[PDB]
Ligand binder design. Structure first.
Ligand SMILES: CCCCCCCCCCCCCCCCCC(=O)OC[C@H](COP(=O)([O-])OCC(O)COP(=O)([O-])OC[C@@H](COC(=O)CCCCCCCCCCCCCCCCC)OC(=O)CCCCCCCCCCCCCCCCC)OC(=O)CCCCCCCCCCCCCCCCC
Ligand SMILES: CCCCCCCCCCCCCCCCCC(=O)OC[C@H](COP(=O)([O-])OCC(O)COP(=O)([O-])OC[C@@H](COC(=O)CCCCCCCCCCCCCCCCC)OC(=O)CCCCCCCCCCCCCCCCC)OC(=O)CCCCCCCCCCCCCCCCC
Ligand SMILES: CC(C)=CCC/C(C)=C/CC/C(C)=C/CC/C(C)=C\CC/C(C)=C\CC/C(C)=C/CC/C(C)=C\CC/C(C)=C/CC/C(C)=C/CC/C(C)=C\COP(=O)(O)O[C@@H]1O[C@H](CO)[C@@H](O)[C@@H]1O
Ligand SMILES: CC(C)(COP(=O)(O)O)[C@@H](O)C(=O)NCCC(=O)NCCS
Ligand SMILES: OC[C@H]1O[C@H](OC[C@H]2O[C@H](O)[C@@H](O)[C@@H]2O)[C@@H](O)[C@@H]1O
Ligand SMILES: [Ca+2]
Lengths: 31, 500, 198, 93, 182, 99
C-alpha cells in the first residue's frame, strides 16, 4: 500500500492501453 | 412501360459514422490518456514543490508596448485585410454539417480533408451561431492575444536579464509580431493557430526544463500532435520538440532512479499518439488513403526539390508577394543570420542565456529547412514565423546593441543591412487580395515619390551606410559617436515603419 | 532560382553540384573560422581573405544586369582552392568527434540528392548521346535522388543518435590510426571524383 | 565546504548557466531581484540544478526566504555546520 | 458632355456608366454622340439607346435562401447568401453564380474548380446555362467587383428520391478506386 | 594531381560541349573585321559592345587564322591550365605548408 506504488501502475497500465487503443482507431468497423 | 429501368449506385464512401465499437474505443483512448497524465503528475509531485501563485510576479506588469500591440491587433481585426483562403474555408465549413463530413468543396471530387481537418470542425460549429466576418475570425484574435501574452512574459524573460530588461527588445518583439501577423494570420487560414501551438510547445518545454518535471513535457507532446493535426505545415511544432529533446532526455534519464522507465515512457506515448482518436473520428484509413491518392494524382504535387518556388513567388512584384507579404520572412532572416554568426563567435554575452537562445534559433532553422516536404509551396506558409520572429528580433536587438557590438564598423554594417532589407521590401506593389484592395494607395504600381521609387532611396541610403562602414574599416576606427546615435535599436524602427 | 529549375538544361546536375559544393565549403570554412579561432596547419591570415573574396564576389554579383545561371563560372578558381582547404580543416574537425563527421557526410549526401534531381543535358549539340539528358537519373526504375535522400535521412538519424548520447558516453574522440586519419577527409573527394567521372 | 569564496564560486556557475549573469557580478551583498534580475521562476531553476550537480535539497518553504547572496551562503553554512554526516561530499566538492 | 466609366475588357459588350451627378438639375434631354474617327480595322464601336436602369440590391434580388455557386474567393464578402449544399453524394442545383473580377475569375477560379479535376464547374456545364447579369458597385462606378451570372436549365427536370440503405464496413474496405483521369 | 587535371582538361578541350554563347561571340568576332566596329550582330539595332569589346577584338584576330572550334577556344584552356598551376603552386603553399 502506497500512493506511489499505485501511481506507477496507473502510469504504466492505462498509459499503455491508451496507446494500443489509439493506433487501432483507423482500423475499426464504421457504418 | 414495364421493364424499363436505370439503376445507378451513388458513391457515398465518405459519409460514414462510427459504430458502437469505434465510439467505445475513442471515448476510452482519451480517459486512459488523461488518467495516465494524472498519474505522471502525481509522480512528478514527488520532489516536494507546489504552486504558490496562480500568476507569476513577472506577469503582473504593464508596459507601453502591451497597449500598442493590443490596440493594433484589436483595430486591425476590424478594418484589416483578409487572406485569400477565407471564402474557401468558409464555403467548406458552412456545408460540413449537411454533407456529413469535411468535404473539400471546390475540387477533388468532394474528397475530404483527410487527416488534417480537426480545426475546420471547430469553424463548422462556430458557423451555427453566425457566419459574419467579425465573428467567425475570433480564434484568430484570441490566438494573437495569447501569442503576445506568451511571447512577452514567458519567452523574453527566459532569454536572460538583458533581453527582459531592455525596452528596445520588447518594442522590436511587439512590432515584428504585428508586422508578421497583419498580412498573413488575419483571415481564416490556420497559420495563426500553428504559430501559437509551436509557441505553447516551446513554452511548455522551457517550463519542463526549468522546474525539472516531466508533466509539462507530455503536454508539450500533446500540443505538438494537435498542432501537426491542423495542417501538414505544422512540423514547426515538432521542430520545437527536436530542439528541446536533449534536456528532456536528461530528465527522463534522471528521474528514473526513483520510479523506473515505464511509468515515464508510457504516458509520453499515450499523449503523443492520442491525436489519432481525434483525426480518425469520422473518416477511416481507407478513405484517407483514397483522398490522398486523389489529391496527389490531381492537385499540386510540388516534390521537395521544387522548394525554391516559395521564394521565387516572393520576389515577383504581384499581389502574392507584396510590400506587406515580405516582412514576415525578411525580418526573420535578417534577425536570425547575424545573430547566429554572433552567437558562434561569442560564448559569453553576459546577459543572454545560451540554452534558450540556441533552442530558439534551432527551431527557426529546422522550420525553414523542413518547410520542404510539404505538399504545396505557397507564400501563406510564412505566417508560421509570426510568433518565432518576434523573439528572434528581440534577441537580435540585444545582440547588436552598442554594448554588445562594441565596434562602430559592425553596427554600421548592420544598419546598412537593415536599410538594404527595407529597400528590398519596398520594391513591389501595395496590393491586397480581393476587397481589401479597394482604395489602397499604391494597389497597382510600385510606390514612387515622384519619378524615383522608394526602394531606390533606401538603396542609396544603404550604399552610403556601406561606404561609411568601409571607411571605418580602412582607418580602423571604433569609437565613433554619430554611429552610436544612428545604430541604437535599428530593428524596432525598421519594423514600426512597415507596421505604420 | 535559374540554377535550380525542374526539367531544365541551364541548371544541370553537374552545374548544381559545383555551386552547392562551393557554398558548402564557404559556409563551413566561415563557421570553422568563427567557432574555432583558427584552422591548425593553415595560416589564418590569407585563409580569411580567401573567404572574404568569395563572399564579396557573391555579393557584388547583385549589380549585374543579366543573371543567368552560367555566370557562376567565375568562381571556378576560388572553388578549387577552397575545397582543398575545406577537406583539410574538416579532417581535424570531424576527427575530434563522431557527430561532426556524420553531419559532414549527411550534408554531402543531401547536396548529392538535391543535385541528382535535375537533368544531365548540356546544350543543343552537346546532348547527342549523353545518358540522362532528357530525363532525371534513374538506376533501374527508382530515381537516384530518392536513394540519396533515404541515405541522407539515415545519416541524419545517426547524427541525431550520436547527439542525444553526448551526455551519457561523455566525450570520447576517435583514435588517430590509419583507418581514421584518412576517413574523415575522403568525403568531398569521393563525391567530387564521382561527379568528375560522370 | 563552509568557505564563502567556494559557495559563491559554485553558485555563480549555476547562475551563469541558468540566467546568463556573469560570475563577477555575484557579490555577497547583491539581491536576487533588485540588483540581479533573477525572478522566482529562475530561483526554482537554480534550486533544481543545485540538487543535480551537488546533493542538496533546498526546501520550498525556505527557498523563498533567500533574498541576498549572503543569505544563501549563510543558509548553506548553517545547513553544513549542524549536519556533519554530509555524505553528499562524494566526488563533488 | 459626360465621359463614361468603362470597367470590363474592351473587345466585347459592356455597360458604360454616366452618373446622374455629372448632369445638372436642368438636364431634361440626353442624346449620344459617338465618333469613330479611325481608319484602321480592328477598332470599332457599337451603341444601344440610353437607359436609366431600375436597380436593386443583390441581397434583395438574390434571396438569403436560394442556392448560389460562390467561387472560392467570394465567401467573406457574401456571408448571407446560401451555398450549394450537397448530401449523400448528390449536389443541389444552383440558381446564380458569384465570381471575382475578370483577371481573377479567368486564371484562378476557373482552373482550380474545373470539371476535369473535381471542381463544381463539371456539373453546371452539363446541366445549366450561364447568362451574365448586369451589376454595379454602388457609388464606386468604374470598379470591378466581380460578376453575377444566372443559371437557366437546359430542360425542365425535377429532383430525385434517391433510395437509401446502410451497411457496416471493416475499416480497411474499399469498393475500388474513383474515376479520376482516362 | 597536375598531370591528372591537365589530362582531364585537355581531353575535354576536344570531346566537350560548348556553352550557350559559342556561336554568338563567334559571328560577333567574324563580322567585326569589316563593319568598322564590334557590332552586336543579332540585336540592339547595331549597337556595339562598347565597354566590353576587348575580348571580341582578340577573337577577331584568332578568327582570321582559322575558324575551327578547336582553335578559337585555345585561350579558354590556357586560362585553365594557368589557373590550376597557380592554385596548386602559389595559393595552396601560401595558405599553409601542411595543406
Ligand atoms: C536530411 C538532410 C539534412 C541536412 C543536414 C545539414 C545541416 C547540418 C549543419 C549543422 C549546423 C551546425 C552549426 C554549428 O556548428 O553549431 C554549433 C553550436 C554548438 O553549441 P554550443 O556552443 O556548444 O552550445 C550549445 C548550448 O549549450 C545548447 O545547445 P543545444 O545543444 O541545446 O541545441 C539544440 C538544438 C539547437 O542547436 C542548433 O541547431 C543551432 C542552430 C543550428 C543552425 C545551423 C545552420 C547553419 C546554416 C549556415 C548558414 C546558411 C546561410 C547563411 C548565410 C546566408 C546569407 C543569406 O539543436 C537541434 O537539434 C535543432 C536542429 C537543427 C537542425 C538544422 C537543420 C538545418 O551549436 C550546436 O550546438 C550545434 C548542434 C547541432 C545539432 C545536431 C543536429 C542534428 C541533430 C538532429 C538532426 C535531426 C534528426 C531527426 C530527423 C532529421 C532528419 C529526418
Ligand atoms: C549595399 C549593401 C549590400 C548588403 C549590405 C550587407 C553588408 C554586410 C555584409 C558585409 C559582410 C559580408 C562581407 C564580408 C564577409 C566576409 C568578410 C571576411 O570574411 O573577411 C574578409 C575581410 C576582413 O578580413 P580581415 O580583416 O583580414 O580579417 C581579420 C580577422 O579575421 C578578423 O575578422 P573579423 O572578425 O573582423 O571579420 C569577420 C567577418 C566574418 O563573419 C561573417 O559573417 C562572414 C559571413 C558572411 C556571409 C555573407 C555571404 C553572402 C553570400 C550570399 C550567398 C547566397 C546563398 C543563399 C542561396 C542558397 C539557396 C540555394 O565578419 C564581418 O566582417 C562583418 C563585418 C564586416 C565589415 C564590413 C565593412 C564593410 C562593409 C562592406 C559591405 C558591402 C559588401 C557588399 C558590397 C556589394 C553589395 C552590393 O572582410 C572585409 O573587410 C570585406 C570588406 C570590404 C568590402 C568592400 C565593399 C565596399 C564597397 C562599398 C560600396 C557598397 C555598395 C556600392 C554599390 C552601389 C553602386 C550603385
Ligand atoms: C565599366 C564598368 C565600371 C562597369 C560596371 C559594371 C556593372 C555592375 C554594370 C555595368 C552596367 C553596364 C554598363 C551594362 C552595359 C551592358 C548591359 C547594359 C547589359 C550587359 C551586356 C552584356 C555584354 C552582358 C554580358 O552578359 P552575358 O549574358 O554573359 O552576354 C552574352 O555572353 C557574351 C559575352 O558577354 C555576350 O556576347 C552575350 O550577350
Ligand atoms: C510559484 C509561485 C507560487 C511563486 O512564484 P514567484 O516567485 O514568481 O512569485 C507562483 O509564481 C506560481 O508559479 N504559481 C503557479 C504557476 C501557474 O500555473 N501560473 C499560471 C499562469 S500561465
Ligand atoms: O488550406 C486551406 C484550403 O485551401 C487550400 O487551397 C489553397 C488555396 O490558396 C492558393 O492561393 C490558392 O491557389 C488555393 O485556392 C486547400 O488546399 C486547402 O484545402
Ligand atoms: Ca473603324
Amino acid at each position: 500500500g502506497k500512493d506511489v506504488r499505485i501511481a506507477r501502475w496507473v502510469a504504466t497500465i492505462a498509459g499503455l492501453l491508451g496507446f494500443v487503443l489509439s493506433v487501432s482507431i483507423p482500423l475499426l468497423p464504421v457504418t | 412501360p414495364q421493364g424499363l429501368s436505370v439503376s445507378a449506385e451513388i458513391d457515398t464512401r465518405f459519409t460514414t459514422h462510427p459504430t458502437a465499437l469505434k465510439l467505445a474505443a475513442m471515448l476510452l483512448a482519451i480517459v486512459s490518456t488523461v488518467i495516465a497524465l494524472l498519474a505522471l503528475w502525481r509522480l512528478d509531485r514527488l520532489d516536494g514543490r507546489r504552486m504558490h501563485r496562480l500568476i507569476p510576479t513577472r506577469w503582473r506588469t504593464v508596459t507601453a508596448v502591451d497597449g500598442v500591440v493590443v490596440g493594433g491587433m484589436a483595430i486591425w481585426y476590424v478594418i484589416g485585410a483578409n487572406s485569400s483562403d477565407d471564402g474557401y474555408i468558409l464555403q467548406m465549413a458552412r456545408t460540413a454539417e449537411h454533407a456529413g463530413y469535411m468535404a473539400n468543396y471546390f475540387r477533388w471530387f468532394g474528397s475530404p480533408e483527410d487527416p488534417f481537418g480537426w480545426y475546420y470542425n471547430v469553424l463548422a460549429l462556430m458557423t451555427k451561431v453566425s457566419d459574419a466576418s467579425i465573428w467567425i475570425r475570433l480564434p484568430d484574435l484570441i490566438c494573437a492575444l495569447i501569442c503576445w501574452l506568451l511571447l512577452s512574459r514567458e519567452v523574453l524573460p527566459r532569454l536572460g536579464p538583458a533581453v527582459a530588461g531592455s525596452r528596445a527588445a520588447m518594442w522590436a518583439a511587439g512590432l515584428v509580431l504585428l508586422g508578421a501577423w497583419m498580412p498573413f494570420n488575419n483571415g481564416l487560414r490556420p497559420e495563426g493557430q500553428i504559430a501559437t501551438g509551436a509557441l505553447i510547445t516551446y513554452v511548455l518545454i522551457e517550463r519542463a526544463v526549468t522546474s525539472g518535471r516531466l508533466t509539462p513535457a507530455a503536454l508539450a507532446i500533446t500540443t505538438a500532435a494537435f498542432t501537426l493535426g491542423i495542417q501538414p505545415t505544422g512540423l514547426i511544432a515538432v521542430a520545437a520538440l527536436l530542439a528541446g529533446g536533449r534536456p528532456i532526455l536528461r530528465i527522463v534519464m534522471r528521474r528514473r532512479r526513483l520510479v523506473g522507465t515505464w511509468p515515464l515512457i508510457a504516458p509520453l506515448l499515450a499523449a503523443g499518439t492520442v491525436i489519432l482518436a481525434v483525426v480518425f473520428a469520422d473518416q477511416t484509413i481507407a478513405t484517407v488513403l483514397e483522398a490522398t491518392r486523389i489529391r496527389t494524382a490531381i492537385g499540386p504535387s510540388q516534390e521537395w526539390w521544387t522548394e525554391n518556388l516559395r521564394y521565387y513567388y516572393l520576389i515577383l512584384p504581384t499581389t502574392d508577394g507584396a510590400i506587406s507579404r515580405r516582412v514576415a520572412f525578411v525580418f526573420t532572416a535578417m534577425c536570425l543570420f547575424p545573430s547566429l554568426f554572433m552567437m558562434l563567435r561569442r560564448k559569453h554575452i553576459a546577459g543572454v542565456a545560451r540554452g534558450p537562445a540556441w533552442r530558439l534559433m534551432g527551431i527557426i532553422f529546422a522550420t525553414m529547412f523542413f518547410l520542404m516536404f510539404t505538399p504545396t509551396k505557397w507564400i501563406h506558409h510564412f505566417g508560421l514565423f509570426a510568433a518565432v520572429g518576434g523573439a528572434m528580433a528581440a534577441l537580435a536587438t540585444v545582440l547588436v546593441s552598442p554594448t554588445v557590438l562594441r565596434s562602430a564598423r559592425n553596427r554600421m554594417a548592420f544598419l546598412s543591412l537593415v536599410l538594404f532589407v527595407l529597400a528590398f521590401c519596398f520594391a513591389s506593389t501595395n496590393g491586397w487580395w480581393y476587397v481589401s484592395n479597394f482604395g489602397a494607395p499604391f494597389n497597382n504600381s510600385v510606390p514612387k515619390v515622384g519619378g524615383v521609387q522608394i526602394s531606390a532611396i533606401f538603396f542609396a541610403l544603404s550604399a552610403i551606410a556601406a561606404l561609411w562602414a568601409f571607411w571605418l574599416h580602412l582607418t580602423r576606427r571604433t569609437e565613433s559617436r554619430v554611429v552610436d546615435r544612428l545604430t541604437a535599436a535599428p530593428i524596432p524602427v525598421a519594423a514600426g515603419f512597415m507596421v505604420v | 532560382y535559374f540554377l535550380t529549375v525542374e526539367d531544365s538544361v541551364d541548371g544541370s546536375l553537374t552545374r548544381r553540384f559545383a555551386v552547392l559544393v562551393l557554398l558548402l565549403c564557404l559556409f563551413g570554412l566561415i563557421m570553422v573560422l568563427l567557432r574555432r579561432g583558427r584552422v591548425p596547419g593553415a595560416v589564418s591570415g590569407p585563409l580569411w581573405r580567401l573567404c572574404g573574396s568569395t563572399a564579396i564576389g557573391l555579393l557584388l554579383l547583385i549589380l549585374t544586369p543579366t543573371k543567368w545561371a552560367i555566370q557562376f563560372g567565375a568562381f571556378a578558381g576560388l572553388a578549387g582552392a577552397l575545397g582543398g582547404v575545406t577537406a583539410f580543416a574538416f579532417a581535424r574537425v570531424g576527427l575530434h568527434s563522431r557527430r561532426n563527421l556524420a553531419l559532414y557526410v549527411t550534408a554531402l549526401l543531401f547536396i548529392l540528392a538535391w543535385a541528382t534531381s535535375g537533368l544531365n543535358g548540356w546544350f543543343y549539340v552537346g546532348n547527342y548521346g549523353v545518358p540522362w539528358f532528357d530525363k532525371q537519373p534513374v538506376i533501374a526504375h527508382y530515381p537516384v535522388t530518392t536513394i540519396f535522400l533515404v541515405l541522407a535521412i539515415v545519416g541524419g538519424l545517426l547524427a541525431g543518435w550520436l547527439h542525444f548520447r553526448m551526455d551519457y558516453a561523455g566525450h570520447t574522440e576517435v583514435a588517430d590510426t590509419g583507418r581514421n586519419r584518412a576517413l574523415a577527409s575522403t568525403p568531398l573527394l569521393i563525391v567530387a571524383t564521382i561527379m568528375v567521372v560522370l | 565546504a563552509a568557505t564563502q569564496e567556494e559557495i559563491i564560486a559554485g553558485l555563480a556557475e549555476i547562475i551563469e548557466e541558468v540566467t546568463g549573469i556573469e560570475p563577477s557580478e555575484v557579490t555577497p551583498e547583491k539581491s536576487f531581484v533588485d540588483d540581479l534580475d533573477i525572478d522566482s521562476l529562475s530561483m526554482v531553476e537554480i534550486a533544481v540544478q543545485t540538487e543535480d550537480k551537488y546533493g542538496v535539497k533546498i526546501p520550498d518553504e525556505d527557498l523563498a526566504g533567500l533574498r541576498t547572496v549572503g543569505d544563501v551562503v549563510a543558509y548553506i553554512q548553517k545547513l553544513e555546520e549542524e549536519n556533519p554526516e554530509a555524505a553528499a561530499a562524494l566526488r563533488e566538492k | 458632355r459626360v465621359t463614361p466609366y468603362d470597367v470590363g475588357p474592351t473587345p466585347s459588350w459592356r455597360n458604360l456608366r454616366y452618373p446622374r451627378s455629372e448632369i445638372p438639375d436642368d438636364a431634361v434631354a440626353v442624346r449620344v454622340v459617338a465618333e469613330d474617327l479611325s481608319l484602321s480595322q480592328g477598332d470599332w464601336i457599337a451603341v444601344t439607346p440610353p437607359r436609366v436602369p431600375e436597380l436593386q440590391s443583390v441581397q434583395e434580388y438574390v434571396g438569403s435562401d436560394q442556392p448560389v455557386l460562390m467561387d472560392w474567393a467570394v465567401g467573406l464578402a457574401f456571408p448571407c447568401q446560401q451555398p450549394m449544399l450537397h448530401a449523400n453524394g448528390v449536389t443541389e442545383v444552383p440558381k446564380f453564380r458569384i465570381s471575382p473580377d475578370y483577371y481573377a475569375k479567368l486564371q484562378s477560379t476557373d482552373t482550380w474548380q474545373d470539371g476535369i479535376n473535381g471542381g463544381l464547374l463539371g456539373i453546371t456545364d452539363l446541366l445549366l446555362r450561364a447568362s451574365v447579369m448586369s451589376t454595379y458597385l454602388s457609388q464606386d462606378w468604374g470598379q470591378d467587383w466581380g460578376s453575377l451570372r444566372k443559371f437557366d436549365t437546359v430542360v425542365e427536370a425535377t429532383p430525385a428520391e434517391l433510395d437509401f440503405g446502410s451497411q457496416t464496413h471493416s475499416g480497411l474496405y474499399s469498393p475500388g478506386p474513383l474515376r479520376i483521369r482516362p | 594531381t597536375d598531370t591528372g587535371v591537365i589530362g582531364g582538361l585537355l581531353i575535354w578541350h576536344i570531346v566537350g560541349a560548348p556553352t550557350s554563347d559559342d556561336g554568338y561571340n563567334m559571328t560577333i568576332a567574324r563580322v567585326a573585321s569589316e563593319a568598322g566596329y564590334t557590332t552586336n550582330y543579332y540585336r540592339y539595332f547595331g549597337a556595339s559592345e562598347a565597354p566590353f569589346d576587348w575580348y571580341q577584338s582578340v577573337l577577331s584576330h584568332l578568327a582570321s587564322i582559322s575558324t575551327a572550334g578547336v582553335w578559337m577556344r585555345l585561350p579558354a584552356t590556357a586560362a585553365a591550365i594557368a589557373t590550376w598551376l597557380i592554385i596548386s603552386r602559389c595559393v595552396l603553399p601560401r595558405i599553409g605548408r601542411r595543406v
